[PDB]
Amino acid sequence: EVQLVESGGGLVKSGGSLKLSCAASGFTFSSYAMSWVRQTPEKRLEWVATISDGGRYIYYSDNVEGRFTISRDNAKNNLYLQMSHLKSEDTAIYHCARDSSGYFPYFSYWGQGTLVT
Amino acid sequence: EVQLVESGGGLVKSGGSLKLSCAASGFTFSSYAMSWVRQTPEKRLEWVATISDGGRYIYYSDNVEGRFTISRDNAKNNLYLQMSHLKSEDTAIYHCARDSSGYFPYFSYWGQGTLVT
Amino acid sequence: AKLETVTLGNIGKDGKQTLVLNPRGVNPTNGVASLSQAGAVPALEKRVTVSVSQPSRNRKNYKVQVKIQNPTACTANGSCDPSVTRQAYADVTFSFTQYSTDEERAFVRTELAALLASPLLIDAIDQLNPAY
Amino acid sequence: AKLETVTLGNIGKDGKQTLVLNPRGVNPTNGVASLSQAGAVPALEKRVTVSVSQPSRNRKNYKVQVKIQNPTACTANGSCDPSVTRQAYADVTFSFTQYSTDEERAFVRTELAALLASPLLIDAIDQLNPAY
Amino acid sequence: AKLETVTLGNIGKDGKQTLVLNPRGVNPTNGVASLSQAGAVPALEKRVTVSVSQPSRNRKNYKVQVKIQNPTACTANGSCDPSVTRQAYADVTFSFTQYSTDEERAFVRTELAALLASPLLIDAIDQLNPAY
Amino acid sequence: AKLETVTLGNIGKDGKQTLVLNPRGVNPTNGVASLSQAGAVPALEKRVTVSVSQPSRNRKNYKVQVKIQNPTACTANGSCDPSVTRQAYADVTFSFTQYSTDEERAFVRTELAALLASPLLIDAIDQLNPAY
Amino acid sequence: AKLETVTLGNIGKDGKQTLVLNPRGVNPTNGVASLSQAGAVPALEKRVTVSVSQPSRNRKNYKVQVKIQNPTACTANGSCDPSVTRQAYADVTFSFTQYSTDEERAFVRTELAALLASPLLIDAIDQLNPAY
Amino acid sequence: AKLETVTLGNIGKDGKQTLVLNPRGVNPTNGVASLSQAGAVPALEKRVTVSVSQPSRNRKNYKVQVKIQNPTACTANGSCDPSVTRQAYADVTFSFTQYSTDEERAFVRTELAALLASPLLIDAIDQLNPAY
């Protein structure tokens, strides 16, 4: 079964840095594209970033692009998200999604997520 | 390569006479039609004359027809332009063009030109 | 992988057309996966097949093989339903040995995806001009 | 078109490599354009061929055919020149009839270029897993 | 010479029509140059071929050979795309020896261009009347 | 059932290793369904096959057969390719009659799966001690 | 490359003569590509041919061959046609292996092209003096 | 003339290398005069020979022949001596008649020496592209 077990999170003040991960077991990780999807405590879903198959083509959103990076490790099956500058609005759950077979994704599978502040 | 090296030019008073030429190396000269194209010092391009394959069909412009002749030598690969009466307006550069395969030309290749006054 | 909808975008001579392919199961008799379009009549569908064959006691090589079939349709005089007039096929066969690593297999996949968008190959296929 | 040099970019699994290809002239026996890698000895380089056929009394339709090969060099001990260990092949062949338009032939070329980057054909080619 | 666009003017029974022929490369298998029109469908094009053959160990003569193919198109009842109904060919073969000068070869070229515009030949080709 | 990816967990001697098997299609002649591990150089992969006799009306004996083989790689000096020193086989074959019930079959499976965790057979296989 | 018109400059004994060669098509059977000078009466023309072995995968020896022949005309009395008194041949043949590199081939070409300007070989050919 | 030391300058691919050839005596049986480069281990030297037919009264055809061969060294493991992997040959053979003049012979020599600097033959030998 497709399973995405995240890690990281915690209580970090503004201007700091983080690194999340995603376990991604149950399928060939190095074939599919990946994504980070966030959910505010106001209960609205927003998009963060996508990374392609080999890590070549990367799409960020507007409120992410200046200060976050996304990467992956196809031999350790992990899916990272380095954070910086933490401008007091990103206090989400940060789900780890599996992208659909296609040109822009529609998020077939999901994960539990890690609370950040 | 198609190359058109002109000669002639100089400072000639009105009412005189000249003869230009064109080197025309790099292709079978006796297959294509030829042309003289002038460029005024006011930076506008004008047409002078065309001569056909064997020198049979000849087209002049209006300000050229009464006093210029055009000729060619298919054994020496030259392309001439005899001038007369030099009525103070023709002070151009006189490019030597190679005509396109067709019924009226569109001037595929060009040359440096010779300043006349 | 697993058969799901392969929605392909940026298709066409201009590059604005998309195509969605809905899966139609795997044939157990020869191991050929099948994708198809969303038409009702089965003869008017654009279908894609794909199959990779293990090395048997005769062939000794792995063999990925992808096929593409695109029909076009038009109705004639005195006829009601559209028939099928043309067929534009495609047929890609890969071949690797037992000792090839996966980077050698991913080089050939991404080389062929980059040749098809190069001005030498978009002139021999769109315009039908040999490379001269 | 014209046999020029071909720089294939964003090639490979990671997508950071290049593969530059110089023309090697057509063949008067078959009419097959050929290309090879920029800087390598003969018979140890990556080859790309392409050939377009017209109708005849045999076949009533056109036929474009690309065919790439790329070896692997193993510098054995006690020898100055490398040997080849194995080849890897990919031969595409298209088939278009004489009434097919320009946007039907370009639809096939761009569908195939967009399909080779899909997780159905990633996992089928560089991993050799069939589609279930 | 070199293949470029041969835009022919003053064509037709009245003499006001033009035709532009865009080059489509040289076939290496038989040395036949090719010009064609600017259609999309390859069966609706007006094409011109031209080839001059060196004297081999059998034929002993130079041989210029020019062909012209003009199809016409019309759609029928219950049909959408236009098909091809007629073919109006032309086939000119020249033949010279090894010792012929170029003025002998240019006399035959300009004689044939002058016979085709004479009232004996514009009546046998336009009206299909034998010269009686 | 339908083949899917099988993740075997807490396998090994210490019991803290995994084995991820991907499906590899059904052999159409004999019906043997293959599984294999995603490891590069496909000459050396963990391979598991399963074979069940087909349900017919006049079949007297149903027979399940499971095979496991695991190679070990050896980067020999003077060769760019790893080779297979040796294998490690396993051959499980069940046998039932057409009047056997579900609990009689499930008892044999869970008995064999509990003998292989018993200290009689973790000592008859791992240490090669015959029982006496 | 593709055949074009070749203008050889400062050729001759004094070094102030030209030789303009036009292309004359590829012989389809053996692949020999011809060049010839635009001179009337085509029995007497400066003729240059070039022949390269085709790039194959299993070819062991690559071989370039260049031939030059120049006739001299003689207007004999009692004949309207000039005849050929004699020829003047030249036969350059290279030979390489499939592991040779670009600089090893370019060194042999520029060496032969610099021996023919050296006073050893402008005296062994022009004056027919054997070296002793 | 008499053999002397020949210094070939600006030879090579880039055109900034030399080749100093010393004389090596006339072979008394066939008249072939040798030149060789001062390099140690005389199994591997740049070697150039020249051969001219002797001026006799009743000789009908004069024939100049030039040969070049260049070996490449390979310090194989387990041997104290370098060996020859491969050669690189060149074979120039002229042919004249007894009524040929000095300018007819000097035209062929300076033509062949100017074709080898032309971009037709720096591409037919260095890159092994057949002209088409």
Curated annotation (Swiss-Prot), chains C, D, E, F, G, H:
Tell me the leader sequence span. Answer: none
Question: In the UniProt annotation, what is the result of changing residue 75 to A?
Answer: In strain: QB_1 and Qbeta_1_FR
Query: At the top level of its lineage, which domain of life is listed?
Result: Viruses
Q: Where in the cell is it found?
A: Virion
Q: What functional role does this protein have?
A: Minor capsid protein.
Q: What else is known?
A: This protein is translated as a fusion protein by episodic readthrough of the termination codon at the end of the capsid protein.
* Protein name (database record): Minor capsid protein A1
Gene source species? Escherichia virus Qbeta
Q: What is the lineage of its organism?
A: Viruses, Riboviria, Orthornavirae, Lenarviricota, Leviviricetes
Whole protein: which stretch is covered? Answer: 2 to 133 of 329
